[PDB]
Amino acid sequence: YPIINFTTAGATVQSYTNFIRAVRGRLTTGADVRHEIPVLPNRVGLPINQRFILVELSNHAELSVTLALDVTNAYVVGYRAGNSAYFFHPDNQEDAEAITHLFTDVQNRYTFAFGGNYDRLEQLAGNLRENIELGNGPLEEAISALYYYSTGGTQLPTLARSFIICIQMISEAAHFQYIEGEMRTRIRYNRRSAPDPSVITLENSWGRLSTAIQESNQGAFASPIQLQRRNGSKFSVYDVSILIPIIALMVYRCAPPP
Amino acid sequence: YPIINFTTAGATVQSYTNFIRAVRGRLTTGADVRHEIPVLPNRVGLPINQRFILVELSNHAELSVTLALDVTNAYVVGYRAGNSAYFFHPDNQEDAEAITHLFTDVQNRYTFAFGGNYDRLEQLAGNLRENIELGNGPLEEAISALYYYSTGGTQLPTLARSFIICIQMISEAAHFQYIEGEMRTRIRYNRRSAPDPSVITLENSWGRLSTAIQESNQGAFASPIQLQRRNGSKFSVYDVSILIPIIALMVYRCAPPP
Numbered sequence: 001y002p003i004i005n006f007t008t009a010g011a012t013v014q015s016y017t018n019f020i021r022a023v024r025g026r027l028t029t030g031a032d033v034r035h036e037i038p039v040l041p042n043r044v045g046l047p048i049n050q051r052f053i054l055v056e057l058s059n060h061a062e063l064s065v066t067l068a069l070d071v072t073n074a075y076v077v078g079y080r081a082g083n084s085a086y087f088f089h090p091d092n093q094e095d096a097e098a099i100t101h102l103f104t105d106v107q108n109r110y111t112f113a114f115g116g117n118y119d120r121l122e123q124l125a126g127n128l129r130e131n132i133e134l135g136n137g138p139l140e141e142a143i144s145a146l147y148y149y150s151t152g153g154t155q156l157p158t159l160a161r162s163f164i165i166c167i168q169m170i171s172e173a174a175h176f177q178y179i180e181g182e183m184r185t186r187i188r189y190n191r192r193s194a195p196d197p198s199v200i201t202l203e204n205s206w207g208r209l210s211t212a213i214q215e216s217n218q219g220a221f222a223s224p225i226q227l228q229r230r231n232g233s234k235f236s237v238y239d240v241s242i243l244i245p246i247i248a249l250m251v252y253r254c255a256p257p258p
Numbered sequence: 259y260p261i262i263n264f265t266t267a268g269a270t271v272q273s274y275t276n277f278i279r280a281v282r283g284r285l286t287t288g289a290d291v292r293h294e295i296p297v298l299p300n301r302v303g304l305p306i307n308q309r310f311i312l313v314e315l316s317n318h319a320e321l322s323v324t325l326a327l328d329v330t331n332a333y334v335v336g337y338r339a340g341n342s343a344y345f346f347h348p349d350n351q352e353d354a355e356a357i358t359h360l361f362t363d364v365q366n367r368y369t370f371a372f373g374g375n376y377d378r379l380e381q382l383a384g385n386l387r388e389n390i391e392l393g394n395g396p397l398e399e400a401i402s403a404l405y406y407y408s409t410g411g412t413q414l415p416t417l418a419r420s421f422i423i424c425i426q427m428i429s430e431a432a433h434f435q436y437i438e439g440e441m442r443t444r445i446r447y448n449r450r451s452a453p454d455p456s457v458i459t460l461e462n463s464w465g466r467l468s469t470a471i472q473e474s475n476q477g478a479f480a481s482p483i484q485l486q487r488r489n490g491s492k493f494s495v496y497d498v499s500i501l502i503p504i505i506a507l508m509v510y511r512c513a514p515p516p
């Protein structure tokens with residue numbers, strides 16, 4: 001499958017930016033763009049051979065892990081750390097069968113009982129996104145936790161917390177130029193801070209925003225979506241135009257109108 | 259005032275296109291653009307010295323006339339043909355006073371009792387836009403009619419009909435890239451044909467389209483505007499996005515939101 005490499009060791013805003021441009025470039029075919037926003041491939045009819053891309057992450061401690069991203073939604077589906085592969089609970093037969101094509105060469109393959117969505121992951125992590133730190137240092141740490149899961153070195157709460165950081169720093173930054181900007185600021189000043197309300201509200205409404213845009217009357221939404229600003233003030237979106245510098249990829253919801 | 263020259267003698271699609279790009283360039287300051295469409299200057303606070311531009315038209319018969327265009331709406335306000343100037347009925351004191359600054363050097367100045375809007379002009383012309391021919395040949399003819407008005411050569415129905423052709427080939431083509439395209443086709447094939455429904459419906463709703471766009475919720479219209487296709491099928495516009503390749507200039511209706 002395509003593999004993209006990124007190391008947290010000595011990451012700068014440009015090597016991180018290059019990494020996220022490369023992931024978006026693998027996720028998209030260029031075939032489907034609606035109101036200037038690329039739509040991800042539709043899962044019905046996609047061949048297994050084009051279903052996943054892999055992301056190989058390395059850290060300052062010279063440890064690596066490879067995450068498998070699903071190309072229809074850019075979400076992390078499972079991962080490899082040396083001799084073992086772990087996959088989240090497939091929530092349908094089609095996906096149960098698809099993940100058998102990943103990391104076939106690994107000896108021990110495990111499937112967790114829990115899925116990879118945020119709520120399960122926050123329950124298991126014993127903590128919410130609002131309290132978990134994101135930045136180059138948290139991702140550095142996450143690479144190690146994930147890698148030492150193999151050998152009893154990581155307990156399930158640190159595993160879940162490391163999954164939340166990976167998914168927001170890779171999958172969500174690819175879904176949104178806005179969240180990628182948020183991560184670049186953290187790297188520029190080498191800060192680590194929990195996500196503010198605008199980040200979490202964007203992440204929660206990615207699927208609904210994709211549908212509202214694709215079902216729109218020429219860009220006009222039938223019902224408005226309320227998002228939040230950094231300080232928590234709510235605001236309504238009525239049109240795709242203001243989301244164009246904010247969302248970078250949409251999940252396929254319907255075919256483009258005539 | 260700025261003056262732009264155009265001759266119907268040997269007009270091609272590029273000399274006509276150059277002429278309409280020059281008129282739009284004089285009408286607009288570049289200061290106010292909303293959803294990629296330029297807004298014309300607001301009449302409250304505009305100095306008289308920047309209120310009009312002049313368009314000097316010549317034809318194959320080596321006759322000229324100069325029309326005065328109002329810069330707040332690109333409409334024809336009056337005209338000069340040699341020793342005489344004629345102005346439409348000013349419909350307010352502010353405009354009565356403004357037109358005194360035009361063609362001051364002419365000996366005979368007249369103000370018609372009728373205004374220049376389409377209905378009055380169709381009544382006087384004894385004919386509707388749907389039946390009047392537009393093209394390089396009708397504009398050629400209009401230049402002569404307008405010029406011979408001075409000397410009893412043109413009767414008021416031909417005067418009104420010549421005003422309808424000038425206003426659609428200059429003011430409306432500047433208001434709309436669409437109507438300018440319509441006129442370029444006529445010149446390319448040297449055809450003359452009356453305007454179809456999409457043209458007349460655009461002309462009739464220029465003012466309402468300007469307000470709907472400037473009062474929009476981020477591009478989304480509160481109420482849709484029904485326009486017509488060439489064959490007369492009605493269709494609704496819900497968003498400014500589809501009007502962007504169609505309208506080139508908007509009349510000022512309100513100040514741009516924060």
Ligand SMILES: Nc1ncnc2c1ncn2[C@@H]1O[C@H](COP(=O)(O)O)[C@@H](O)[C@H]1O
Pocket residue numbers: 075076077088115116117118119167203204205206207
């Ligand atoms: N495999 C996954 N990895 C990370 N986040 C996910 C995954 N699947 C879903 N999500 C996100 O978690 C939340 C709930 O997911 P879901 O239960 O499929 O709607 C939504 O914000 C999803 O975008």
Ligand SMILES: Nc1ncnc2c1ncn2[C@@H]1O[C@H](COP(=O)(O)O)[C@@H](O)[C@H]1O
Pocket residue numbers: 333334335346373374375376377425461462463464465
């Ligand atoms: N001076 C003018 N010359 C040509 N058309 C005009 C002029 N003033 C208004 N119109 C158009 O004629 C119609 C009626 O004008 P009004 O009576 O001002 O709304 C509308 O389509 C206007 O855009």
